[PDB]
Amino acid sequence: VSLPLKPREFGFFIDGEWRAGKDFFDRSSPAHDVPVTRIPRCTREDLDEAVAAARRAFENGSWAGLAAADRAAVLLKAAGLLRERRDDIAYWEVLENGKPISQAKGEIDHCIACFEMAAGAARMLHGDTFNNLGEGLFGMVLREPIGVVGLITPWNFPFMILCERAPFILASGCTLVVKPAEVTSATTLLLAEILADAGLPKGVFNVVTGTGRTVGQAMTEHQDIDMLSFTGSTGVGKSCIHAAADSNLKKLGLELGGKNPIVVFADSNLEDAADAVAFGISFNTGQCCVSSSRLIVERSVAEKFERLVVAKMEKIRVGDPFDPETQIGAITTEAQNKTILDYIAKGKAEGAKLLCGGGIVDFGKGQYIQPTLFTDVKPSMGIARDEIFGPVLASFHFDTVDEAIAIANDTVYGLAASVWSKDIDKALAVTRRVRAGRFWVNTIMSGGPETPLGGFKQSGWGREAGLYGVEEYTQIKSVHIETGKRSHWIS
Amino acid sequence: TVSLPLKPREFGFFIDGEWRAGKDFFDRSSPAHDVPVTRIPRCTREDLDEAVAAARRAFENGSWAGLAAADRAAVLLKAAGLLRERRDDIAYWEVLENGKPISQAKGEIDHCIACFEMAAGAARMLHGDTFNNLGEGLFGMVLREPIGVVGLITPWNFPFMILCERAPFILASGCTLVVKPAEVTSATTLLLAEILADAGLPKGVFNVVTGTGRTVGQAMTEHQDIDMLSFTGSTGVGKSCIHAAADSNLKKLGLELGGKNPIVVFADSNLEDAADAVAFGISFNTGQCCVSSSRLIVERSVAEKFERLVVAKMEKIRVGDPFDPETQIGAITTEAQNKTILDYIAKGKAEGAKLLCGGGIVDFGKGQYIQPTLFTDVKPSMGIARDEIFGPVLASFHFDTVDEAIAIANDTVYGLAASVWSKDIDKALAVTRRVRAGRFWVNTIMSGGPETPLGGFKQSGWGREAGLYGVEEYTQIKSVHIETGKRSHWIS
Amino acid sequence: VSLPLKPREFGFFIDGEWRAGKDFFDRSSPAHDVPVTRIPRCTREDLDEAVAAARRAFENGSWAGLAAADRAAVLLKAAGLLRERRDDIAYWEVLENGKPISQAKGEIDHCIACFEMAAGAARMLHGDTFNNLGEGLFGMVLREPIGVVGLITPWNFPFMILCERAPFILASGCTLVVKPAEVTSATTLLLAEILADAGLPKGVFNVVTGTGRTVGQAMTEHQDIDMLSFTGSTGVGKSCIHAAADSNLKKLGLELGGKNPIVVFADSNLEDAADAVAFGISFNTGQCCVSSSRLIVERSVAEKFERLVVAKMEKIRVGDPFDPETQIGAITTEAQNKTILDYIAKGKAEGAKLLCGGGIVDFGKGQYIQPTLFTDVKPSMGIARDEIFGPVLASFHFDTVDEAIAIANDTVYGLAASVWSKDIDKALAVTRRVRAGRFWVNTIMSGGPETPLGGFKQSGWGREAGLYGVEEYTQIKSVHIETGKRSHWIS
Amino acid sequence: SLPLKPREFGFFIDGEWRAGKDFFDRSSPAHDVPVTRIPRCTREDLDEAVAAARRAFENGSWAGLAAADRAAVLLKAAGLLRERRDDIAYWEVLENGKPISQAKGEIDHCIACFEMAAGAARMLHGDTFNNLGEGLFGMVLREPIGVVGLITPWNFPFMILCERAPFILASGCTLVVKPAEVTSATTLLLAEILADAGLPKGVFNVVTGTGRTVGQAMTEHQDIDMLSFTGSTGVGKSCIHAAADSNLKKLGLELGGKNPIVVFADSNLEDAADAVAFGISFNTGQCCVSSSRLIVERSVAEKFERLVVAKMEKIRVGDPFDPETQIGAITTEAQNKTILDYIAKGKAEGAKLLCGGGIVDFGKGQYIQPTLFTDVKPSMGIARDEIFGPVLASFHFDTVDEAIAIANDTVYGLAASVWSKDIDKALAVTRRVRAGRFWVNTIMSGGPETPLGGFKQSGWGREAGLYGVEEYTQIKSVHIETGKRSHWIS
Ligand SMILES: NC(=O)C1=CN([C@@H]2O[C@H](COP(=O)(O)OP(=O)(O)OC[C@H]3O[C@@H](n4cnc5c(N)ncnc54)[C@H](OP(=O)(O)O)[C@@H]3O)[C@@H](O)[C@H]2O)C=CC1
């Protein structure tokens, strides 16, 4: 594959029209150090306008007003266009993020599935009828789109996270104002192209690109946005919350990442489990809200199992993201690169044993990190508690099932969890007693958009995808009708 | 003839199944009789750190959440049955601390019994999803589980009834509770703690920590070990709870806040039926109600006549002693709210709106009473048009077309409740669909049991209470994916 | 618009292969009297072969072990090939049935809608988990396809009823043996071609064409069919029930027709109502099971209303179905035509008062009948009680809402009913208290496949369409797991 | 304890007790002493009862009330059931022969059924479609079907009655009950309870008598809208014919089974053995859901077979009034003979008896001993046919797929059991064995929260849970258009 001759100039998208931009962020491949894109830096005026378009499009019934059939037509068309242009979107995703082309193309197939699921849930979205309240009273509960929804996506899965929110938000008849990561805006603008091509009315999907402190905060505080999906860090989630209270009490769907445990029992398929732990921390080079960063292993196989994980971690093919054979790609931002390398550092200083990795992968160009494992970890240590968002794995030992669930639940977070055992009783106890919203039993990062996803504790608020994720962006209306004459209260 | 107690009743607070005495005490006097009635314990943040501890042990020990929905349903159904037995007591204390008429107060208790039976029913029906349709290899599952320790903060306007519209739905899932009633209406909450204990609630599953919002309330909104908070009250304190949550442990919030609820009357409605419903809407609980009908929106052809029919109803309402079963509206619960409502009437006059009725106190020598009030010639900018007054003050708006009615009905930062009054299916259905309010009444007002959810759009808050939706608000959805057979390795 | 020069010779479809006929039913256009098709008359051996194909396809995992993603992918591509080939299915539907081409094309749009809905339901199909049963006991309710489903369709909506059943049945992973009506077999075989083109595995969808006395009855008694969808007459529905009892206790989806009421209040839009009444009884020339055959109008406006309906019925364009302006077309079978003319005869003979129509429309070629309205009908009269399946309207008068409901309920059936009132309390009273499974308030025959459909009383069993319809062809399994060691019953 | 004279009952129509003009004289199957006098009613008594249920449905005296009111009557009934638990246990043993310990454990599940039902009455809901356009609104209503017939068998007279009646009642339906002729008492005691709890007249009618007079009158009745029937596939088939031949009444059928219990070595073979013993011995094998086909892994089969033999040879048989008695009498001489006939045929077909095989001459009554046959071929009579006695047949297997084929080698699909600690095997069996009531490392567990019912020839529809309450509701689709309509003719 060739890298671009010249960087690709992009516009931003508002009320159906693409605009040129007056200031531009030049993004380079973090894998190649060569310019690839020019994304417009939008203003608060650019954002107020996007929100104004989204409101017009909602109120004038051009989208919420249609039969669900017509919202489903657009999402099915989009899903179809997505498949047609998969190789395009994978190409651009890799260029801005650094992920392997194989991983990228896998994610595009999941997006297609997301759109098709949303198209289905557009028609299935329902409330209740209560015909059982008596001859006088009729109850019913309606669902309706909340209105103008702002979506803020991070740079880990720019296109897949975008596609795990946008189609579910639209299916109910909501309008969208999206602000992608500045470093990964291109695949989000390509979705704009696709949705326009698939016949999405003007104003319904608007992309305002730029920084979180200009456009992001202008959205988190905006007085006319009804609800915000934000996916990212617990810190910036907490900013969104303050902004909500301080503005218009807008609803918040928060997906905020975590310190996710993977519990391994001696009576598991140790080989398969070791493969899953390696994938679970190396996948997207460990730049993952749902990565399995804490290993919780039965002591009887702890030392063995750790070294099985090393065996898998050192076999991982690191290289050019464009090589179909490459398994893990580049660290997306220099900021995240220094954080990760600084955490491994501290870990070695806090008193932990480096069993493997701990260093960069020298390619001359780009930023790469070795899959890393740490043992002899105290729950005090920084690498035991803090989300590192790199391919660094801490190991912890347990004697009894109660101990494993306690070490797994010793977090402020609660996004994902994993349990590896052949014992139905152990699998169900850990599954039912570890406070996490996304669980895998003898599997890793499976599940389509059929099912919801989200976090316990500090890993956020609400659930995305499935019929539950369509529903999050609808408002519940209770309606009581009295039939016949009413007994007057007064005299 | 009802008699007030000879000496104020000194209560305790309830932590880990044990009842506590109190060190410092708040002295409450009837809002309607101006007579000492209760002595509630002023609690501490340490008393609260301990209540949350009682509830964490109760949730972590499996004494309620490891029990079966049937053993939790048994307690709730027992609780409903103890409420039927004690209806008269709860009525008495609620009246003493609130000012409500006794008749209303007894009505509210029957809704509270319905609520507990709904919670007992939901406890068994609480369910997630199976996905047997994902392939030979993959099996999908969505669990629900109790979120854990729930902080509950109730207001003073429906002290016992709003408590019974939260506590039992929270308890059904296997959540543990820590409750703060309002300090002016703390007694009937501690009576509920009595009922739940006699009904066989395990220790620690229900704690009641009485005191102020500035001390205990805040300590709860920022508590590091409370998993969810249910707040009912004002949008302003709701924003406080949101901030508190972000600065503490990113706890979930059930917020049920204020309203400026419209009631749309069309000319083709039953004017006399609608007039009665409007006066009730705004006068019930002396307009001290988040779901009150505080904005009349009436069709020009019948607007002035209807305004005058509503004032004739308003002025026929029997005001007096809340213990007289003939009394229809009661006292204003707090001096603050009294002063706020008289200030708003004052503003209403100042800003150019015309009083048609009311606009001052009702003198009984003892108590704080306000006369039902209607303003007309109200412009949408006016304070009385926009601000929640939380008294019996109604602002009337005139409209020509259905589109205008709905424009005015939506013309608020809020969206808790709404009413539409028409016999035309097309209008009722239009206004029901296009007005952004989470609780709607077609040719009725404040009807519907706990079968259905309730809650707000916009600034009237987050989440829904009651029905199955209510039980589920305090649960966490857990996705489970199981792979059966040998896995295809990622790494050769 | 050209008629076929020679009749088009089909084969049947078994285990993904087209099979030639040995013997053939020759069908001529019910409206042109020109040969149009030659369809294979199959045997019980051909039926047995198709069932064994459908059985091997369900137990091999070629469709039912597949993921809901894969099934949805075939159903969505099918819907896509259906819109692509819309005009070709219409052409052949019209040639065999008599439908106006305009109505034909509209029925195709609904078929597409049906396919998209089933595709969405393929993924949404779910059971229930019970986490609340205690720390010892975990409960769980699974749905799974029932297995080999027999589908038997009538000639009135050959393709539309097919598409309102087949895709819903397929969505769960059930396999099909289809037997359409011999007079209208062509569009069912064109769906077999379509399904195959869209990537449906072999054995999932077989069509065995032939008579009810041979293949139909062979299906109703088949010892390896798990469930049977029959649409048609109460009489054959009852046959099917007897067969299931004498066979393998297969579940039955029965859609068996009715004498449906349309309730017209004076406070209604009488103009809109009159149009609706004309449509309800004239649409598909009254050969609809959801046909408004019983007008129940308020006495205060009955005479005025009756005249309006008559004004509507005479303005109805009857003629060659391929003229895009014809609004009603030919009677499908000479049997039904004799039944309709006999019922109009009987009607007149029993003292009923003919207001309009009441005889054939002579075009020299074809079989056509006039929109026909009787007044002065007593509930004892034959036209009042018996299903005519022609464009014949009986008018009843009422004075009270009670009398309207009492009349509307005065039948053994309960498939459809309509109410026409601007009064919310009257429309609600009639809706809640009239025993009909398919209701229309100030409309007639609205509603895509989002919602279930089916009958009360003697109009049949079970529901079709919506997520409820997909679930009708699944079996509910309850699973209880106890975790830990158990309390022995024997010490 | 000893009954001095038979207790002569009445039947219950339109809230009144009517007197029997002819009677069935039941004797305790365990004591051979006259215990009860059940009125044998006429087909005009049945028509009279259906007319009452119909009246009570149509006058909105029950269906018309708020769910809150239906729930009250049901919760009150649950109350009176707990406070009368002993009375009903007494009469339940007297007519059935079941151990008093087991009888009381049932009344506890019956109370569970009543409370669930009361919850379901309030939570019963359909759907709103607000997603169809500015002009189109869509809505799905559920309503009580109307007058339901309920026929109960004699194995669990009161528990199966309570596993149908409260769920049928919760939606707004009225009922016409015919308990089993040998076991009508506890059903008549339920009628007394529902009345005292404030259930209107006509909502719950009991017409006692024969299946040939009253039952068949019901399955054919032109004004019964639906029939729950629990029992045999053949009387189910008779009900199907009768429905077709009459008015097309819907049918909630819960029929019989040959339910396999699969035991792997990966299991707690000791916890399984106790469960297999139970599975087959509970109610002296007089269960539609009894584990009657042991499916065990060859490698541990002979060991396990023995471990179960030991468990069966230890079960305490005797006076059902002894609270230490673990299995009781055979309810009918008809069944007793069928069971011995089947043990007899089993020896004859070349199957090996490891234990049981004959009656238990406990002084009086009909008591049969827990019986285990091994070296059973699928062709054998005892392999295929439902025995409804404590007779277990043992099969051996090497593979999981092998195990699943034997379990699915039946015309039935009511119950199944899997005993394994391997999640993969438990999950495969559960997913691939066509049975509607599943138990993984447990047996006959499950409360009213979960629906129950059969695959294949074990019946139609589901009972219990919210799904079970909904089976007796009818789905109405409502589409409303708003504003002026595009006219079809100019
Ligand atoms: N009782 C009612 O509801 C009445 C119904 N009608 C309407 O008249 C129309 C014509 O009915 P009619 O032609 O008599 O029959 P049906 O429409 O009921 O038969 C429909 C289908 O069943 C097949 N079939 C025939 N015999 C059997 C059998 N023994 N077992 C299973 N399937 C069988 C037919 O095959 P084949 O092609 O060989 O016929 C056909 O494909 C129906 O659409 C019905 O709605 C009108 C009067 C009364």
Numbering used by the authors:
A (entry chain B), C (entry chain D): 8 to 498
B (entry chain A): 7 to 498
D (entry chain C): 9 to 498
Task: Quote the paper.
Finally, L‐sorbosone is further converted into 2‐KLG by a NAD(P)+‐dependent L‐sorbosone dehydrogenase (SNDH). Sequence analysis showed that the SNDH of G. oxydans WSH‐004 belongs to the aldehyde dehydrogenase (ALDH) superfamily (ALDH‐SF). Like other members of ALDH‐SF, SNDH has three typical domains: bridging domain (Red), catalytic domain (Yellow), and cofactor binding domain (Green). The crystal structural analysis found that the SNDH could exist in two different catalytic loop conformations, i.e., the oxidizing SNDH (O‐SNDH) with a closed substrate pocket and the reducing SNDH (R‐SNDH) with an open substrate pocket.
